[PDB]
Amino acid sequence: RFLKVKNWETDVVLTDTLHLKSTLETGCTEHICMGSIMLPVRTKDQLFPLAKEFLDQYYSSIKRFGSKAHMDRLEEVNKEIESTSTYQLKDTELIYGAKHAWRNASRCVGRIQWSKLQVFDARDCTTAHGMFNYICNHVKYATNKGNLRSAITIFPQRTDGKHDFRVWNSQLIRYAGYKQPDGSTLGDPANVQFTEICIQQGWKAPRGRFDVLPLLLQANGNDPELFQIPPELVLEVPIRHPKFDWFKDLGLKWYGLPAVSNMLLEIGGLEFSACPFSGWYMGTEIGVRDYCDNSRYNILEEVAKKMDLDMRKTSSLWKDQALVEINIAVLYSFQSDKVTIVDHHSATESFIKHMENEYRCRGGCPADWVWIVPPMSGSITPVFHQEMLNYRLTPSFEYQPDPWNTHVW
Amino acid sequence: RFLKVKNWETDVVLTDTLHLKSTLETGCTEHICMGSIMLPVRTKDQLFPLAKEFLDQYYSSIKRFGSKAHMDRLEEVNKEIESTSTYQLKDTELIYGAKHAWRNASRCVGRIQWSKLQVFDARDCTTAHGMFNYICNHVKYATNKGNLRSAITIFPQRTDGKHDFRVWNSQLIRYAGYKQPDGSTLGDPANVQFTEICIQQGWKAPRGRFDVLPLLLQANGNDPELFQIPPELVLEVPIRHPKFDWFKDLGLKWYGLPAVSNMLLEIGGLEFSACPFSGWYMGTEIGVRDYCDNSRYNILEEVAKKMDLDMRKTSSLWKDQALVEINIAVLYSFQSDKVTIVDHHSATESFIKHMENEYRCRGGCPADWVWIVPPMSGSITPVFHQEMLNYRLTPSFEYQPDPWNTHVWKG
Ligand code: HEM
Ligand code: HEM
Ligand SMILES: Cc1cc(N)nc2cc(-c3cncc(CN)c3)ccc12
Numbered sequence: 001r002f003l004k005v006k007n008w009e010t011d012v013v014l015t016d017t018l019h020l021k022s023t024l025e026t027g028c029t030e031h032i033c034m035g036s037i038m039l040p041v042r043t044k045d046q047l048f049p050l051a052k053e054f055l056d057q058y059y060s061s062i063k064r065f066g067s068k069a070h071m072d073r074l075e076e077v078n079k080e081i082e083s084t085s086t087y088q089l090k091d092t093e094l095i096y097g098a099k100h101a102w103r104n105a106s107r108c109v110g111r112i113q114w115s116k117l118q119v120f121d122a123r124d125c126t127t128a129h130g131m132f133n134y135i136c137n138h139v140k141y142a143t144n145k146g147n148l149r150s151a152i153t154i155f156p157q158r159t160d161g162k163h164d165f166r167v168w169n170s171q172l173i174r175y176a177g178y179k180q181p182d183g184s185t186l187g188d189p190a191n192v193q194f195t196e197i198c199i200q201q202g203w204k205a206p207r208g209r210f211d212v213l214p215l216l217l218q219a220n221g222n223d224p225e226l227f228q229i230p231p232e233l234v235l236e237v238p239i240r241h242p243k244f245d246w247f248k249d250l251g252l253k254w255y256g257l258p259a260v261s262n263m264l265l266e267i268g269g270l271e272f273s274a275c276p277f278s279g280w281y282m283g284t285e286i287g288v289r290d291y292c293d294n295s296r297y298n299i300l301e302e303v304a305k306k307m308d309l310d311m312r313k314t315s316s317l318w319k320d321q322a323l324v325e326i327n328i329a330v331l332y333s334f335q336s337d338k339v340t341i342v343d344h345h346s347a348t349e350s351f352i353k354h355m356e357n358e359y360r361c362r363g364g365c366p367a368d369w370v371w372i373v374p375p376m377s378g379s380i381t382p383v384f385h386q387e388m389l390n391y392r393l394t395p396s397f398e399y400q401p402d403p404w405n406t407h408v409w
Numbered sequence: 410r411f412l413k414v415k416n417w418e419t420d421v422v423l424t425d426t427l428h429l430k431s432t433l434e435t436g437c438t439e440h441i442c443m444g445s446i447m448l449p450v451r452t453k454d455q456l457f458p459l460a461k462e463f464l465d466q467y468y469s470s471i472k473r474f475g476s477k478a479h480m481d482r483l484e485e486v487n488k489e490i491e492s493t494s495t496y497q498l499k500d501t502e503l504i505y506g507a508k509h510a511w512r513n514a515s516r517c518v519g520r521i522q523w524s525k526l527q528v529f530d531a532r533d534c535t536t537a538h539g540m541f542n543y544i545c546n547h548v549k550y551a552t553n554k555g556n557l558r559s560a561i562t563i564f565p566q567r568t569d570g571k572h573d574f575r576v577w578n579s580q581l582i583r584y585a586g587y588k589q590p591d592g593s594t595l596g597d598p599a600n601v602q603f604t605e606i607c608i609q610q611g612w613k614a615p616r617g618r619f620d621v622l623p624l625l626l627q628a629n630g631n632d633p634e635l636f637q638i639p640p641e642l643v644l645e646v647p648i649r650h651p652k653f654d655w656f657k658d659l660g661l662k663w664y665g666l667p668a669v670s671n672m673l674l675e676i677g678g679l680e681f682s683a684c685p686f687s688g689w690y691m692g693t694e695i696g697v698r699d700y701c702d703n704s705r706y707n708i709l710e711e712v713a714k715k716m717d718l719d720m721r722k723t724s725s726l727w728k729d730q731a732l733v734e735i736n737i738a739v740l741y742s743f744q745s746d747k748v749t750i751v752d753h754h755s756a757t758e759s760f761i762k763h764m765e766n767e768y769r770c771r772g773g774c775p776a777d778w779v780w781i782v783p784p785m786s787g788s789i790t791p792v793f794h795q796e797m798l799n800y801r802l803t804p805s806f807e808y809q810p811d812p813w814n815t816h817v818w819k820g
């Protein structure tokens with residue numbers, strides 16, 4: 001129960017003690033591994049032990065476990081819970097909580113940067129208009145003229161479940177998707193239902209292939225509100241190839257800022273249902289997933305056509321060939337435009353370093369092999385031959401149902 | 410209890426009930442997933458339950474459950490166990506066993522072919538020489554002039570664990586690897602330790618970058634003996650590229666017959682410690698892993714150099730580019746030589762179809778996502794988007810420690 005993990009490319013062996021501090025469950029049992037499954041209103045008695053575990057962590061990290069300051073805080077929170085049926089995080093705890101939620105995100109390959117996170121406390125927010133303002137400042141700060149900076153903005157915590165703050169967008173910036181008359185799909189197919197929700201709520205769509213969606217912001221449980229992100233804040237990159245001049249005529253571009261906004265940040269038992277966070281892209285997320293997935297932009301066949309590869313048989317590996325050039329082009333475009341981006345070799349190497357460090361300083365590092373290994377060229381990245389243990393630590397980012405299935409108007 | 414798996418590219422959802430018939434463990438708990446860990450004497454006390462459940466399985470498959478034949482076979486195995494501390498499988502039972510072992514192999518993307526397995530019963534073998542002869546015949550039959558056929562050869566089951574049959578090779582056909590004094594490796598780095606053993610056991614090593622290794626064969630718990638596979642039986646393919654003429658000048662070849670010989674076949678409680686089995690290659694096993702793994706032939710740089718790629722910055726994706734062309738060349742070479750091979754696109758597609766079929770007629774299909782997804786171009790194959798449940802059924806193929814780490818030498 002002091003588990004070893006081995007790297008089969010380097011014979012490096014690491015001992016994991018940190019999994020011992022695991023709270024939540026995995027959905028796996030002794031009889032079935034569910035490690036590839038995408039997606040497997042608290043009470044007063046539920047909250048205090050949750051609050052205690054977190055404060056114990058916190059005061060331990062500032063080298064003050066068991067101190068007067070620690071005890072007094074524990075007492076203070078304990079009083080507040082009995083009385084208010086919840087409690088409030090101190091600024092310093094809020095920052096620790098956010099940074100550590102990222103650190104514990106076993107599906108995230110970029111966690112080597114985990115401690116350099118910019119936390120924007122928006123707990124004083126009361127309206128969607130106010131949310132729009134916090135969100136615009138997030139986007140501007142994080143983008144930073146192409147020199148991306150990681151950030152999270154944290155809106156008021158859940159209270160009774162009827163006063164929830166939600167960003168209805170899955171990411172702050174995404175391209176729209178419209179289903180065409182001939183059955184096809186213009187723009188981004190993944191966003192079709194949401195794109196039609198905006199329209200079905202008053203959005204006037206330009207119906208282009210790359211229309212930046214509007215923000216749908218829900219404050220204190222009210223009906224959500226539409227806002228257009230000032231285009232001057234949406235940093236976009238035209239996609240060209242360093243060797244293929246025709247590449248530009250495909251007319252592709254992507255946004256520079258990956259900013260996920262549909263997850264729930266849980267700290268000390270407290271639930272932050274609106275907490276959009278952002279960093280910078282790994283090249284493959286755009287090139288492999290966004291562009292080439294069949295259920296997305298699916299440009300492979302079109303690109304392969306321009307290269308004049310042999311698309312008659314699958315054993316020509318024309319898909320693979322095209323896949324590579326596309327990802328070469330995405331990296332090349334971003335880099336030329338001085339927008340931050342990381343290639344899948346650099347990032348997986350970074351993560352391997354990060355692993356070493358966490359075993360060396362923390363005694364372990366939760367990691368989800370199925371998500372850490374890039375969607376192309378898997379086995380020539382170091383992570384592929386790295387055994388990983390996946391377990392659930394807290395604070396954490398968790399999934400939550402899409403608002404339109406829950407909300408009442 | 411039901412369980413549903415979803416394909417996120419097709420929105421197809423399937424319901425698994427087969428996982429309920431799962432006996433063995435995964436290595437996972439509620440608090441930890443170990444799905445990415447590579448590796449997660451048996452008396453009569455536990456043998457007859459294992460026997461009964463297998464026989465129940467078998468006679469269900471042939472639609473004779475509870476029949477006279479079923480009952481009497483149960484009684485027969487019962488008395489033979491209490492009398493002899495073990496039992497023998499009938500031919501039918503052994504054939505069913507090998508087939509279903511393959512079928513239950515959750516890390517195998519090629520199980521669409523599981524029903525068509527040629528089962529060679531070598532349970533009468535008593536010596537290493539007899540082993541050599543059975544294996545030659547396997548290799549000849551399986552290779553079939555390049556038109557490959559699935560086969561498995563089953564040698565005698567373990568008894569007291571002191572008289573094991575083992576094939577000390579991890580694969581029947583595999584290239585030697587020699588650690589040079591300067592630190593470099595000639596041949597296959599994967600096979601260096603096994604090569605050294607062979608050399609120690611008296612193998613005159615040619616010391617080239619593609620020397621077929623000698624068979625090292627152990628019968629009845631005796632010390633292993635060296636045999637050379639006759640070259641005319643070892644089908645190989647020169648690797649060339651369809652556009653790049655300099656590729657052939659890299660001097661690469663590879664064998665056609667993937668024949669894994671180091672695993673353990675468990676059927677109805679019995680353990681077959683030596684049971685070589687072979688199919689045919691998915692292209693990526695050779696082009697991605699054998700050639701481009703840093704701990705193998707690792708030709709990426711010499712290929713990249715010849716392509717004149719920008720190798721000074723890894724964001725040029727020159728590694729990625731070199732990898733595709735090598736896999737292109739492996740596929741081209743095999744196809745041109747009419748030696749059976751399958752590309753990772755065809756194979757994963759086939760497996761998805763198989764998998765769906767298995768949910769419809771069997772109620773599930775145990776699958777290890779981590780191993781099924783191909784080591785290149787993962788998300789543009791359909792298995793990447795396929796949720797998969799991993800559980801262990803019997804009959805099954807299991808791993809065993811390397812024989813040289815556990816063998817009592819006689820002298
Ligand atoms: C700074 C550069 C970063 C990079 C390169 C990066 C990379 C990635 C990648 C490739 C994934 C896989 C998800 C997918 O393929 O769609 C992922 C998931 C994730 N990232 Fe990171 N990330 C970065 C920053 C951050 C930050 C700042 C946070 C939080 C504050 C974060 C939290 C997460 C979480 C929670 C997941 C998985 C969510 C889930 O359960 O689905 N990441 N990341
Ligand atoms: C006929 C074409 C076949 C193909 C293309 C195929 C393909 C594969 C591949 C690529 C792997 C993963 C190995 C790796 O990448 O390192 C695998 C695993 C496996 N295969 Fe197949 N296979 C085939 C036939 C067979 C046969 C005939 C058997 C046995 C009778 C078999 C039993 C297994 C088992 C037990 C594993 C698990 C390996 C392990 O646990 O280490 N397969 N297969
Ligand atoms: C901060 C961040 C940066 C980045 N480059 N990719 C992310 C990807 C995700 C992510 C996790 N699960 C599902 C999705 C589907 N859009 C995305 C979340 C955050 C990310």
Ligand SMILES: Cc1cc(N)nc2cc(-c3cncc(CN)c3)ccc12
Pocket residue numbers: 579580667669686687688689690691694
């Ligand atoms: C029947 C069969 C066919 C095939 N094409 N590849 C296999 C690959 C393996 C396999 C699994 N893990 C590790 C290795 C390394 N030798 C091989 C086992 C059986 C295979």
Ligand SMILES: C[C@H](O)[C@H](O)[C@H]1CNc2nc(N)[nH]c(=O)c2N1
Pocket residue numbers: 036037038370371372373417793794795796797
């Ligand atoms: C079913 C499967 O788990 C699903 O396709 C996962 C696999 N691994 C992934 N890995 C990353 N990084 N991102 C993803 O969206 C997924 N999707």
Ligand SMILES: C[C@H](O)[C@H](O)[C@H]1CNc2nc(N)[nH]c(=O)c2N1
Pocket residue numbers: 008384385386387388445446447779780781782
């Ligand atoms: C550590 C990790 O489990 C290991 O590298 C696995 C991952 N997936 C694999 N998948 C296949 N097909 N073959 C392999 O050898 C491996 N190796």
Ligand SMILES: [Zn+2]
Pocket residue numbers: 028032033034035437441442443444
């Ligand atoms: Zn698991």
